[PDB]
Amino acid sequence: VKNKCVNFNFNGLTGTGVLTESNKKFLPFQQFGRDIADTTDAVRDPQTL
Amino acid sequence: LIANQFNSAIGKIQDSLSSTASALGKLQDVVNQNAQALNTLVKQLSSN
Ligand SMILES: *[C@@H]1O[C@H](CO)[C@@H](O)[C@H](O)[C@H]1NC(C)=O
């Protein structure tokens, strides 16, 4: 579900927040994104690329 | 003469403040310092 913050857990990486569409071109084996605070910024769905 | 000198000096001050960026440094650095401090705090979230 989108446009609402929910407790997500992608490939063991858990957290809470909204999952919105992204325009960041992730190269083939990109899996997780990290910000300056080492927090998760973007994730790749293992089912849908 | 005093009026002309005052107007020309105000024009020179305008030119200096519009041409010299470092003339604002004594303020900008302060913000930078704060920002720097904040950044350090954020970086301290990466330590184990
Ligand atoms: C898994 O899901 C993706 C997209 O949802 C699909 O392309 C793929 O075929 C699926 N795999 C299997 C084994 O069904």
CA–CA distance, B14 with A26 (Å, rounded to integer): 48
Question: Which amino acid is residue A9, in one-letter code?
Answer: N
* Helices (H), ranges, chain A: none
With tokens 């704060």, the residue in question is B34
User: Resolution for this model in angstroms, one decimal place?
Assistant: 3.9
Tokens found for residue A18: 């909204």
How close is the Cα of A45 to the center of ligand 1, in Å? 11
* Contact with chain B for residue A36, Cβ under 8 A: yes
Euclidean distance between CA atoms B19 and B10, whole angstroms: 14
Question: In degrees rounded to 5, what are phi and psi of residue B26?
Answer: -55, -20
User: Experimentally, how was this structure solved?
Assistant: cryo-EM
Q: Give the distance from CA B28 to its chain's centroid.
A: 4
Taking residue A15's Cβ as centre, other Cβ atoms within 10 Å add up to 13
CA A15-A30-A1 angle, to 5 degrees, is 40
N- to C-terminal Cα distance for chain A? Answer: 16
Instruction: Give the Å distance between the CA of A44 and the centre of ligand 1.
Output: 14
